[PDB]
Design a protein around this ligand. Structure first.
Ligand SMILES: NNc1nncc2ccccc12
Ligand SMILES: NNc1nncc2ccccc12
Length: 272
């Protein structure tokens, strides 16, 4: 299974559990496998978070996925390579004020260590739209510049909060505990966010990729290309054009979802 994954992300480097390999893997993964919620949008739950199910979808079938699928898959890969992987749970606070109601635990991230590491590293390749394209030092206060935006971790209560410089200000993305969460808890969270009528992944369409000094973000029919210099926004004309963008620009095997007419009609009723 390891080979199939490495070919999918077009990785060619060494496979020893080191910092450089972790960097190169995260970079290759985020540039190759899109974030998408086509399953929950089409009424297909994300329930099965085993190595076999995630590799079947994200590698063999050339589909994307969301946080549970992305960090699930890379978590299994890193474990096989010799990294120590702990799975964590998070609450998403992006664009919300500090007095917003407590969000559900619907995000999952990884705490990663390896032979000779000075400290633990945060790995998150599943936070569609703003996922860090580098492993980040799991330490507070330090500004950590990536290939795209800079990131910063801060101590918030009994846990931590990940922040990123978006446009002109520091934005809180998600807060999380560093306590290990059992697989079953992650399944419960993934079920909620993929099946609940109020979930943004059920009511709408979201897709995201990086290629390579730019972010390609899609919210329904609204396509945004974020570069270091600025941002360009494209209003997609119809549901048919949205599907084309998902297949071409985002590299998703849209045929896997089923008949294109059904996907177009779902996008038409939801986004238009
Ligand atoms: N799939 N996990 C996620 N859960 N809630 C909100 C999110 C917002 C952006 C990206 C991923 C998210
Ligand atoms: N470097 N500061 C930055 N701040 N906001 C957005 C960015 C997007 C791409 C690259 C850099 C960015």
């Amino acid at each position: 299974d390891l080979t199939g994954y490495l070919d999918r992300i077009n990785y060619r480097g060494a496979t020893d559990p080191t910092l450089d390999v972790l960097r190169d893997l995260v970079s290759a993964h985020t540039g190759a496998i899109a974030f998408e919620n086509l399953d929950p949008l089409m009424g297909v739950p994300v329930d099965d978070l085993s190595a076999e199910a995630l590799a079947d979808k994200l590698v063999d079938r050339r589909r994307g996925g969301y946080c549970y699928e992305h960090n699930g898959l890379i978590g299994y890969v890193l474990a096989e390579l010799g990294y120590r992987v702990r799975r964590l749970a998070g609450r998403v606070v992006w664009l919300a004020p500090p007095d917003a109601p407590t969000p559900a635990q619907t995000h999952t991230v990884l705490a990663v260590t390896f032979p000779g590491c000075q400290g633990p590293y945060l790995v998150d390749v599943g936070f569609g739209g703003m996922t860090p394209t580098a492993p980040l030092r799991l330490e507070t206060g330090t500004v950590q510049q990536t290939a795209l935006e800079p990131y910063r971790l801060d101590d918030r209560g009994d846990g931590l909060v990940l922040q990123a410089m978006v446009r002109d200000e520091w934005q809180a993305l998600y807060e999380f505990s560093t306590l290990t969460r059992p697989q079953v808890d992650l399944r419960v969270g993934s079920w909620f966010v993929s099946t609940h009528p109020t979930s943004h992944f059920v009511t709408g369409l979201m897709a995201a990729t990086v290629a390579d000094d730019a972010r390609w973000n899609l919210m329904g029919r609204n396509l945004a290309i974020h570069r270091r210099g600025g941002t360009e926004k494209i209003l997609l004309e119809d549901a048919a054009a949205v599907v084309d963008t998902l297949g071409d620009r985002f590299g998703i095997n849209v045929a896997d979802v089923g008949e294109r007419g059904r996907l177009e009609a779902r996008i038409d009723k939801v986004c238009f």
